[PDB]
Ligand binder design. Structure first.
Ligand SMILES: NC(=O)C1=CN([C@@H]2O[C@H](COP(=O)(O)OP(=O)(O)OC[C@H]3O[C@@H](n4cnc5c(N)ncnc54)[C@H](OP(=O)(O)O)[C@@H]3O)[C@@H](O)[C@H]2O)C=CC1
Ligand SMILES: NC(=O)C1=CN([C@@H]2O[C@H](COP(=O)(O)OP(=O)(O)OC[C@H]3O[C@@H](n4cnc5c(N)ncnc54)[C@H](OP(=O)(O)O)[C@@H]3O)[C@@H](O)[C@H]2O)C=CC1
Ligand SMILES: NC(=O)C1=CN([C@@H]2O[C@H](COP(=O)(O)OP(=O)(O)OC[C@H]3O[C@@H](n4cnc5c(N)ncnc54)[C@H](OP(=O)(O)O)[C@@H]3O)[C@@H](O)[C@H]2O)C=CC1
Ligand SMILES: NC(=O)C1=CN([C@@H]2O[C@H](COP(=O)(O)OP(=O)(O)OC[C@H]3O[C@@H](n4cnc5c(N)ncnc54)[C@H](OP(=O)(O)O)[C@@H]3O)[C@@H](O)[C@H]2O)C=CC1
Ligand SMILES: [K+]
Ligand SMILES: [K+]
Ligand SMILES: [K+]
Ligand SMILES: [K+]
Lengths: 313, 313, 302, 314
């Protein structure tokens, strides 16, 4: 597999490059960034190769500036982590538009070298995925973002740790925006295939506290460690692996939705999606509880209220 | 880890020995059998080691008679596959009575050498696990059987392949007898954490035909291939790996039930159970639908009908 | 990846189907065999699938008869296991089956042929001939398994992990096999740099290696797990383009002094294009003379 | 397995905590650091758990100050990463004497809680491993350091990439000091078990350039990326995996040598070693060329010079 990471110089990008290169399926990793970081990206490559000696793997790691994008040719997936972080004062809309410009330019330049999938990781992830689809011209099967996937996994760990089960034993889901308007789906939470509502502990579950903790999780990591890198990279690798082996898996990712749900249309939002070799091959239609569906509609409306201002910027 | 396979000369035993030795956690494998099989088991040892060189793994494989059982000392687990094969005219009770003597003798001898877990694979498995618990004297946590685990996995593959998803995406369960009175738990069937009852293809799911195919799958494999060996070994390795890495996972296995479900007491039957480092650390009590619970109760009545005849044989 | 096993109903074929389907890269496994075996292989497909639920893997396993071979199309590799007799008798009988199957493969698609049937060094030659493929496409297991058995021997004698040893046995998959003590390392450290090489019972170890297979036939009825694991190792090297220096049966066109025009076990660089190179190495005088004798025997049968 | 990473707040410590918790054999990971780092470690734990969800693994990660060390008890291994960073004007002896106090106090305190193995990573690695053995009081088997293991891995990738083979195909070694006096052992360089001296490119091998690049590789990553984190972590995980599964493997690591090589005695230096469940179970005696052995002796003399002045620095 050939995967190009635009923004490997970053925290999440560099961790992602490590986790991907050490995989057997990864054969040609392309580390891209702006010119001033090329030397940094040349150090990263070095470091990665050392790990590849201790893990017993090998790959062909490349390093280039954001001008020569023919290195991106024939790439199966291009992960875009490039973006400006949220400093003090920037409104949600301000960062939305700034990173919209960055990500849309990258998507346009990608679409002009080869026909590939674009895995958007930059925030606002829903709006950036929307701008990526617009500026790439690719199909909806090709453009997707990380969305609320990581929040779903962060909810999964908490449900498991409270229920005394392995993390992988719990399989929950949080659809909607990667933000405060997120909707946790207790209807699609099961532990061993057993709906969580079939256990006597679901009555003792502090769902309100767990959901509050999940909502503020990212800012907590930003404050304690300065930022999350290992978890985001692991989730990215999960999606990439589902693609490389065509594991037709029902994950939750940011996707363009065209009415597969009640009133949800013309928006890139976190949704249940069947991922495989051809990217998002389907937007799975699920039955939601009343509360879940009202919240989902409202969240998508907010996401569209932001998508509007970057569609032509 | 140390695991002793009593009956490694057999089909399932031999496949299990290979798939276990290949694992990193396996460090001492003991292949026990009757004396006339000692030449075969040694010939298996050789074969296994060749494969260990191709996978890059290594383990210390031993071969001994079923009269020298001190080699089993300090074993983490003892997997018992030894048993008579069902023949024409042999009723269910005939096999139960014949193999209860075999498994009870082996469990007795195991208890006299060391204090270990006994993983009974021999059939009728729900009844042989009971005989093993009785004659071993171990705690209810130490003795368990494969039960309906393989049936549940065979149900899983059908639900998944019919829903067009990766097998691992489906997580269904079948509790009850490892036989005709098995009750599949549609209440505990989910696909991606999403209860299958929330999908539109659930109404068009041929549930009755799929359960029919599951109930006859064993006879089918026996008529086409001569017996199942790989899949049973994979399920055995699954349980063994949950034990070794204390993966507190909610599986479906043959276990002694003492009132964790209404009307189900004093029997080894297929039930939901939390497996971890201490074997069966809990018999999880879950909400079953009315039809599922009535079926479970009838199934356990049948199982206890067989258990009473062999308890003192 | 798509891989087809001709003879999956057999021992090695069946175990190899299991070990291959289990892997993430295996996406399409085609099980081929004569018509009378179609029900056995079908049963195999069931058992495999159960194990695929126990390992958490998935694949698309197909079952077809050896008179409907269009399902071999687009295959990355086709492993051919189908196969008072003399050595020449078995060679002559299996040559017909191997050559016919290679022929029918060449008429379906341009793919790689992994010869497992014995005599391996001669059946690989016939596969290449009747296939019409390039020398890089057709290859055989050769002394790969013999080298691995010698590896476990060296390692278990020196008290180290099996993967810590890397020895080789080039030449015939038979009595004229030459073990390369010159190319035996333990941690990359030549075995001749240890105080134990003097105490190594090389004669006994090579005796056991030369009769290893026949003893497995007498004690277990045949080898299935080791052969399948070696086959999986080679298929793994191919799928990920791992340019790895393995010892396999290949056609040699003058890559060693005095040996040519034959498919024999040699040191080779395996990669995405099958055998991408016949590595040329320095052998001690004894090793090269023995390899020449082995080459002439193998060519005598060819 | 229980592993305690002292200095997990650092670069290598954090990467190592991730790579280790992610493995199936890791069941209880203890992340230790000074009090002011306790917040960062608490954040790191969060990151780790998120990764554990995406990898399908799970573990019990703990966080505690460097004053509450009773959590280290029962640890299978204690990786010591804590140390000062080399700075402008800090000489080799300066850093040796400074990190000696840190690692020595940590080794003492570890010995006061439990009898575990100590995996020293802090530099000067050979000297710090010697100080750790001295202050811990443990047997020579229990204390060991990363030494020239990563140097050997970097030499491995270079040899392999020049010979056109997979990295796992090459199995070279570099013994000696993790620094100036390292001796690459071309005697123990094999490619598929074939000594590199049996190939046609051994004559074409740019040995001088490759060894020089390896010798300055560390400062180059330090100047380009600010430090190495992933590769050191992977090597640490390699050694830890050998210890957990009793993989009796012949790795090159920093260990105390008592004459297994001619005259090489009374120092912790990079040596070929047989690692297993009991830590460093043996110092392998191999045949080295004349140049290799003389270089190893020079290296050992340098290491002894540094060990001498920090052996009693509390
Ligand atoms: N769940 C999710 O979807 C999550 C979202 N994210 C998002 O991903 C993005 C990356 O995060 P992280 O890697 O932690 O961030 P860093 O700030 O560490 O790195 C981001 C990279 O973006 C590039 N960059 C910065 N400014 C510009 C610019 N003005 N023009 C072009 N490229 C620029 C830089 O690389 P170079 O200098 O090479 O261009 C920089 O290293 C963030 O926006 C974050 O919000 C991350 C984690 C989770
Ligand atoms: N899902 C499940 O729960 C499954 C249950 N099973 C059951 O497990 C058992 C083993 O199956 P399989 O491995 O296919 O069977 P085999 O008959 O191939 O092997 C069982 C072994 O039992 C030993 N054995 C046979 N008779 C006796 C005896 N009278 N006294 C002592 N030992 C004896 C033999 O080994 P030796 O000659 O060395 O003693 C024989 O190899 C069967 O009863 C089968 O029904 C199997 C698969 C799935
Ligand atoms: N080191 C090596 O290279 C090794 C060599 N081998 C060789 O590979 C071959 C396969 O061994 P194994 O799988 O153990 O053998 P089995 O005899 O158990 O099965 C081989 C298969 O060959 C097929 N077959 C038999 N006769 C014919 C025929 N007349 N025409 C077509 N197909 C036929 C059958 O499958 P179907 O009925 O589906 O055709 C049968 O299952 C043997 O010759 C063995 O010597 C095996 C292991 C290691
Ligand atoms: N091949 C090898 O053997 C290599 C050796 N190393 C060496 O190991 C060490 C780790 O390097 P890196 O991880 O990059 O280092 P960092 O400096 O990033 O982290 C080291 C940690 O040590 C702790 N620390 C710093 N000063 C003191 C002190 N005075 N007393 C106690 N603890 C202190 C800090 O954690 P807290 O504040 O929580 O105590 C700090 O995070 C370095 O000395 C490096 O040279 C690294 C890589 C390879
Ligand atoms: K790779
Ligand atoms: K093992
Ligand atoms: K597969
Ligand atoms: K773990």
């Amino acid at each position: 597999m050939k995967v190009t990471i635009i923004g490997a110089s970053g925290r999440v990008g560099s961790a992602t490059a490590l986790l991907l290169a050490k995989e057997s399926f990864m054969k040609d990793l392309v580390l891209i960034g702006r010119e001033h970081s090329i030397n940094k990206l040349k150090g990263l490559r070095m470091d990665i190769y050392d790990a590849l000696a201790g893990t017993g793997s090998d790959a062909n790691i490349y390093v280039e500036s954001d001008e020569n994008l023919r290195i991106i040719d024939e790439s199966d997936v291009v992960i875009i982590t490039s973006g400006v972080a949220r400093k003090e004062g920037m409104s949600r809309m301000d960062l939305a538009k700034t990173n919209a410009k960055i990500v849309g330019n990258y998507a346009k330049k990608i679409a002009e070298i080869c026909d590939t999938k674009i895995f958007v990781i930059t925030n606002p992830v829903d709006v950036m995925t929307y701008k990526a689809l617009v500026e790439s011209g690719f199909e909806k099967n090709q453009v997707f973002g990380l969305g609320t996937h990581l929040d779903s996994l962060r909810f999964k760990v908490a449900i498991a740790k409270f229920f005394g089960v392995h993390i992988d034993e719990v399989r929950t889901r949080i659809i909607g925006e990667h933000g405060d308007s997120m909707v946790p789906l207790l209807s699609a939470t099961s532990i061993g295939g057993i709906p969580i509502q079939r256990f006597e502990r679901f009555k003792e579950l502090p769902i309100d506290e767990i959901i509050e903790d999940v909502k503020g999780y990212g800012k907590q990591i930003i404050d304690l460690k300065g930022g999350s890198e290992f978890g985001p990279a692991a989730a990215i690798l999960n999606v990439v692996r589902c693609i490389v082996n065509n594991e037709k898996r029902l994950l939750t990712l940011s996707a363009y939705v065209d009415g597969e749900f009640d009133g949800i249309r013309g928006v890139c939002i976190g949704v249940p999606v069947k991922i495989g070799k051809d990217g998002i091959e389907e937007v799975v239609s699920i039955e939601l509880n009343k509360d879940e569906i009202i919240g989902f509609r409202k969240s998508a409306e907010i996401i569209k209220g932001y998508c509007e201002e970057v569609k032509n910027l």
